[PDB]
Design a binder for this molecule. Structure first.
Ligand SMILES: C[C@@H](NC(=O)[C@H](CCC[C@@H](N)C(=O)O)NC(=O)O)C(=O)O
Ligand SMILES: [Cl-]
Length: 122
């Protein structure tokens, strides 16, 4: 084993979605642009846009919904803000990775989400 140290700058994005919707809400465009700003300034970086659902419905339905959400955020980054599409990787995890309790409406809302991050040397 060996010791390690590193210093990086990191932008982390969390976009929430309405029930059974993959539309990016208007109040999230500015947040998404912050991630685009970062990628423009560090051209060697890329990002994986990760979609999720709450647990209402089948695993298979939610796998596809999670992928539609990730692609909707990717479309904003690429089409609206001009990040090269090869630098933005859209994937979905369906309902399999909750960060809140699916037993409550509030927890389900938190789970209906896309997360993305970018890091670069600092
Ligand atoms: C009652 C509502 N039920 C549904 O199962 C779904 C979507 C669930 C989506 C959810 N997991 C999310 O993360 O948003 N809608 C559908 O089956 O087409 C309904 O059917 O009205
Ligand atoms: Cl770079």
């Amino acid at each position: 084993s060996n010791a390690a140290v590193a210093e990086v700058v990191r932008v982390q994005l969390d976009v929430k979605f309405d029930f059974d919707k993959s539309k990016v809400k208007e109040n999230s465009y500015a947040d998404i642009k912050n991630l685009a700003d970062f990628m423009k300034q560090y051209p060697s970086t890329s990002t994986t846009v990760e979609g999720h659902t709450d647990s209402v419905g089948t695993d298979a339905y939610n796998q596809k919904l999670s992928e539609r959400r990730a692609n909707a955020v990717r479309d904003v980054l690429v089409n609206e803000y001009g990040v090269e599409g090869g630098r933005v990787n859209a994937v979905g995890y369906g309902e399999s990775r909750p960060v809140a309790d699916n037993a409550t409406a509030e927890g389900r809302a938190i789970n209906r989400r896309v997360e993305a991050e970018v890091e670069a040397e600092a």
